[PDB]
Amino acid sequence: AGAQDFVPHTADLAELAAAAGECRGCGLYRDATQAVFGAGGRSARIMMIGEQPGDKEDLAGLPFVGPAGRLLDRALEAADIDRDALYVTNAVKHFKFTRRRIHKTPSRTEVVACRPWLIAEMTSVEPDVVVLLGATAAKALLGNDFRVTQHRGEVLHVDDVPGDPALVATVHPSSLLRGPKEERESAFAGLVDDLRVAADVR
Ligand SMILES: O=c1cc[nH]c(=O)[nH]1
Ligand code: SF4
DSSP, X not given: OOSGGGOOSOOOHHHHHHHHTTOOSSGXXXXXXXXXXXXXXXXXXXXXXXXXXXXXXXXXXXXXXXHHHHHHHHHHHHTTOOGGGEEEEESOSSOOEEOOOEEOOOOHHHHHHHHHHHHHHHHHHOOSEEEEESHHHHHHHHOTTOOHHHHXXXXXXXXXXXXXXXXXXXXXXXXXXXXXXXXXXXXHHHHHHHHHHHHTOO
């Protein structure tokens, strides 16, 4: 019936993560190893939200540590942003997969179920800017009909979001990895640019 009953009313990030460890909000906690809560401290100005922990993250207990995360770090270095100044997290907290462990897009039901954790992280960190990496992260805050390819690199502000942070959407780093090698320099320039829009929001 949602993560809501499993969410403590606290701004402490460590208490949130520990309690996320006990969530039975949707079925995703069954096959994953552990919940992967975000990383960073409350002092961060910029929050970055991906889709879900992948194979590596599920085992490392940290978000964006696999290939997608390595590419994301290269894009951060190129955008002159430091990762330790950020708060990084995911729309869904448990890794969803089929049988190598193969990575399955979270369903809308799962996304709505896990959203209370994300709201809690936002009320705590109070970012000035949220960066949405990919479609599922973006739909999570902007509705089921939000299309990233149409609105990428635009400073968005929406009513319902806690704190009225600017919101900037972009492609998930793993889209670049999955894309053809010949477009990778233009796609990467695309991600780096959207990140610089977020960083240049005052
Ligand atoms: O933390 C992660 C890792 C891979 N993909 C994501 O969306 N988030
Ligand atoms: S995914 Fe989000 S909701 Fe479903 S179980 Fe893990 S934490 Fe609870």
